[PDB]
Design a protein around this ligand. Structure first.
Ligand SMILES: CCCCC/C=C\C/C=C\CCCCCCCC(=O)O[C@H](COC(=O)CCCCCCCCCCCCCCC)COP(=O)([O-])OCC[N+](C)(C)C
Ligand SMILES: *[C@@H]1O[C@H](CO)[C@@H](O[C@@H]2O[C@H](CO)[C@@H](O)[C@H](O)[C@H]2NC(C)=O)[C@H](O)[C@H]1NC(C)=O
Ligand SMILES: *[C@@H]1O[C@H](CO)[C@@H](O[C@@H]2O[C@H](CO)[C@@H](O)[C@H](O)[C@H]2NC(C)=O)[C@H](O)[C@H]1NC(C)=O
Ligand SMILES: *[C@@H]1O[C@H](CO)[C@@H](O)[C@H](O)[C@H]1NC(C)=O
Lengths: 245, 85, 438, 65
């Protein structure tokens, strides 16, 4: 049902165990695959029949392995056949196939070497964002105030499409700093850390621009946000149906 | 019942036509002429200025003949044009 | 409900043939009675869906040449085979059962190219399904060039081996009754069109004045083969034609109708006019539709011809007015399956039907009247039969009708036309014998 | 005279039927993209594979609304 792709060189699968076990709790069946030590390619389709309802991509430095496993064409075919997708790409761990696939969806994440900085922050160690910047109550709205740990994260630019669902944007005083001389990628409210996308066939994709959001360390601050975010991206939370017109 | 009917069908003579189809065109072309002659005569009788009690008699007999002929020739001509009755 | 276990199966050999567009099954069964009471009946097991899709069902002795009484009964369903003379409480019987179903395997890749080969997926029970326990069994698959399994099971015994154009399965040696649990899914290669007539309206017109029998058939044909991926490209079809690829393709380009011997005046039309691509050869009528029939396309058309009445109608020996007609039930393409057949026979105006019978069971029969070109009176007697699942060359029987047609009814038709004309003439006379002058 | 470089491709319609002598040609309007990309850009994506796809730079898009 669910296929989890994990690169061991970037971040180990063990680190993100907290939320994965909860999938077994909700009756999800799962299959694992590591691209660092794989030989044969995954088979997403079997004679016009896809074998996975969901796909989870963990932080990975793009290379020959990711391109071999899931090219952009295969990803678009899977997404068009009612497959759900979860993507993660932090500064220093942003692939190229994922970036191109998101560029085909109207989502432009910052490249490698660009990081978010916010000086007017209650946190000097890491990046933290309060629940004030939540942008859609149908995905997650906290009953009481909270804050989420992000650390070294990225931002994305969005187009004016009906299918794009902004979830969490960057703070107003934030900005993109590049190691090089690149013009700042984002600035203020026009940068987004958690974005969603709904197909016209009602498939769903969620992209998080941080590798720290689902780590076992931040289990106390991000447990619920992440839980019902995973509930939304898998057509389990906010699906509607019309009857007897 | 199937058995008995099968045995009957397979132990009988074939169908013999009354008049063969190949002959019917000639019969139709001849009967049409006869019908035309008789009917056209009875129309002459209608135009006749003679009594009524005799015009009725002649017309009725002539029509009773022309109609028999015309029906027979209608059957033959229809069969000969490819529209079987 | 289960039939009592009065019998036991010594040996069971099931061979499935997939060569045609329908599934054919032959069972070699050896049975011995296990109770002391003599029983003349044997029961055959069929699943609900298979039961609905059964077309033909027969059985006989492996030694005799005649058939026993084998009738379907109307959630495993049952067919009953009746024995002519009862059996000893402990004696051997050697039966051979044959069946033809209206089902066929669906294309495994639903969309293939214009020149690619086709494969079909067919799902049937693997161990013998029966209500009488069996102590020996075997399964064979014939008719295709390659056989593979879809999601095979771990157990080695529940697997098969290949021969030449064959696929034998496990020779198991003890099966309980009602053991239809494991289901087998086979994938085979069939590169021909799968023709399916969704509706046939066959009309036979008999005429004693012309001595002719006229056949008019209205087909509603479909192709159940793989659909064309990428859509139809006339350029690719022409490049296949001129390449001289006469390979067996899974789309219909030309149909071959097998007619009764001595037919004349053939014609081939459809709902939009007359089709000019048709050619008659001895006993055969070749037909080319307006467009090739690819997987998933429909085509509704009409064929017709004429024959001599003296080949189907005979006269009774007791009187020259009782006639017996024997009319064929199907005259169509070689390898085709039918889903609904309405067979209508038209007898002349004054005919009174006396006896009817069909060689295969029908779903309905009815008698009414219908007016025609010169039917001033009630009209032609229409006798209609309704059949469901029929197969091209296994339903080769003939319907038998015995009717009466006196000479009075023969001569009454020109008489009716004559009365009409005479009435018109009397009307003209009346209109020309009264003055309307002022 | 017509050359295979004269006729540009169709990105919004699909040929469904051509008669035997090419007299009548029937096309079908294709359904729009689920993602919302233009059918022109899906067509270009299919007709183009380049190793150096493009530069890093940035989109000139307007303000998100
Ligand atoms: C007032 C007097 C006027 C004098 C002039 C008369 C006729 C004009 C001359 C020649 C025309 C004949 C050529 C047409 C026949 C071939 C076309 C065809 O074959 O078409 C027919 C249509 O049947 C028709 O309508 C033709 C009518 C036949 C007319 C014969 C003329 C003699 C009778 C004249 C009327 C007398 C009045 C009597 C009133 C009580 C196709 O039928 P179908 O497709 O249904 O096939 C049927 C096959 N099943 C049954 C198996 C489905
Ligand atoms: C040609 O024949 C086909 C086959 O019977 C007809 O298809 C059916 O059409 C009715 C009405 O549109 C549908 O309810 C059925 O589901 C169709 N059956 C199949 C198997 O497709 C078709 O309508 C006929 N066309 C004409 C013009 O008569
Ligand atoms: C067998 O006869 C006819 C088949 O034509 C069916 O019954 C008739 O069906 C027509 C079709 O609409 C109706 O108008 C009639 O009212 C029906 N009844 C009669 C008595 O004609 C049906 O398939 C069968 N009838 C039976 C078994 O009684
Ligand atoms: C693949 O193996 C480990 C798995 O964690 C990874 O750290 C390493 O960089 C990769 N390469 C080799 C040679 O081990």
């Amino acid at each position: 049902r669910t296929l989890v792709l994990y690169d061991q060189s970037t971040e180990p699968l063990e680190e993100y165990s907290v939320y994965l076990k909860d999938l077994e709790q909700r009756n999800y069946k799962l299959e694992y695959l590591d691209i660092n030590s794989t030989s044969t390619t995954v088979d997403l389709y079997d004679k016009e029949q896809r074998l996975f309802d969901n796909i989870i991509v963990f932080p990975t430095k793009g290379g020959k392995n990711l391109a071999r496993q899931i090219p952009v064409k295969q990803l678009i075919k899977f997404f068009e056949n009612e497959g759900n997708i979860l993507c993660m790409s932090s500064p220093g761990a942003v692939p190229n196939t994922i970036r191109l696939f998101l560029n085909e969806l109207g989502i432009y994440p910052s490249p490698k070497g660009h990081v978010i900085r916010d000086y007017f922050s209650p946190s000097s160690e890491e990046l933290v964002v309060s629940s004030n910047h939540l942008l859609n109550k149908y995905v997650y709205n906290a009953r009481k105030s909270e804050d989420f740990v992000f650390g070294e994260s990225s931002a994305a630019l969005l187009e004016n499409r009906e299918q794009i669902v902004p979830i969490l944007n960057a703070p107003r005083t934030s900005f993109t700093e590049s190691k090089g001389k690149c013009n700042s990628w984002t600035s203020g409210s026009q940068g987004f850390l958690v974005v969603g996308f709904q197909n016209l066939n009602n498939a769903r994709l969620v992209w998080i621009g941080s590798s720290d959001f689902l780590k076992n360390k931040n289990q106390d601050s991000n447990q619920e946000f992440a839980k019902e975010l995973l509930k939304w991206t898998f057509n389990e939370k906010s699906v509607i149906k019309s009857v007897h017109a | 019942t199937y058995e008995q009917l099968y045995k009957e069908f397979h132990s009988s003579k074939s169908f013999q036509p009354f008049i063969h189809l190949d002959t019917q065109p000639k019969f139709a072309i001849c009967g049409l002429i006869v019908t035309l002659a008789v009917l056209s005569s009875a129309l002459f009788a209608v135009g006749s200025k003679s009594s009524y009690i005799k015009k009725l008699f002649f017309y009725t007999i002539l029509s009773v003949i022309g109609s028999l002929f015309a029906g027979l020739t209608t059957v033959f001509a229809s069969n000969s044009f490819g529209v079987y009755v | 409900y289960e039939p009592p276990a009065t019998w036991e199966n010594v040996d069971y050999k099931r061979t499935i043939d997939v060569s045609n567009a329908y599934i054919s099954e032959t069972i070699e069964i050896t049975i011995k009675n296990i109770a002391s009471e003599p029983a003349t009946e044997y029961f055959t097991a069929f699943e609900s869906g298979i039961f609905s899709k059964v077309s033909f069902f027969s059985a006989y002795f492996t030694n005799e040449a005649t058939f026993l009484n084998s009738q379907l009964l109307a959630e495993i369903r049952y067919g009953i085979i009746q024995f002519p003379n009862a059996i000893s409480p402990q004696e051997e019987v050697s039966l051979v059962i044959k069946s033809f179903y209206n089902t066929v395997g669906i294309p495994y890749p639903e969309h293939v190219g214009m020149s690619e080969e086709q494969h079909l997926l067919w799902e049937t029970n693997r161990l013998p399904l029966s209500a009488y326990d069996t102590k020996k069994a075997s399964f064979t698959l014939i008719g295709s060039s390659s056989f593979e399994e879809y999601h095979p099971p771990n157990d080695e015994s529940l697997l098969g081996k290949a021969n030449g154009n064959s696929f034998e399965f496990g020779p198991w040696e003890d099966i309980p009754r009602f053991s239809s649990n494991e289901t087998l899914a086979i994938v085979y290669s069939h590169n021909a069109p799968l023709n399916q007539v969704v509706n046939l309206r066959r009309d036979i017109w008999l005429s004693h004045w012309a001595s002719t029998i006229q056949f008019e058939e209205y087909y509603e044909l479909t192709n159940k083969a793989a659909k064309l991926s990428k859509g139809f490209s006339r350029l690719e079809l022409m490049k296949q034609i001129q390449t001289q690829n006469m390979r067996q393709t899974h789309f219909v380009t030309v149909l071959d109708m097998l007619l009764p011997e001595g037919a004349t005046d053939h014609y081939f039309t459809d709902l939009v006019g007359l089709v000019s691509t048709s050619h008659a050869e001895r006993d055969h009528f070749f037909i080319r539709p307006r467009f090739p029939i690819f997987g998933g396309w429909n085509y509704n058309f009409t064929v017709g011809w004429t024959n001599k009445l003296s080949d189907f109608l005979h006269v009774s020996s007791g009187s020259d007015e009782k006639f017996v007609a024997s009319i064929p039930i199907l005259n169509g393409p070689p390898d085709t399956v039918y889903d609904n057949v309405e067979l209508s026979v038209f007898l002349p105006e004054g005919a009174e039907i006396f006896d009817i019978d069909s060689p295969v069971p029908f779903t309905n029969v009815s008698i009414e009247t219908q007016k025609s070109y010169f039917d001033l009176n009630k009209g032609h007697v229409k006798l209609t039969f309704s059949y469901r699942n029929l197969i091209s060359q296994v339903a080769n029987g003939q319907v038998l009708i015995k009717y009466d047609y006196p000479k009075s009814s023969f001569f009454k038709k020109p008489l009716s036309i004559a009365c009409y004309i005479f009435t018109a003439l009397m009307g003209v006379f009346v209109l020309k014998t009264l003055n309307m002058n002022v | 005279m017509i050359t295979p470089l004269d006729v540009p491709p169709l990105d919004y319609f699909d040929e469904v039927f051509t008669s035997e002598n090419w007299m009548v040609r029937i096309y079908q309007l294709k359904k729009d993209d689920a993602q919302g990309r233009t059918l022109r850009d899906v067509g270009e994506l299919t007709r183009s594979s380049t190793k150096t796809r493009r530069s890093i730079k940035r989109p000139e898009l307007g303000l998100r609304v």
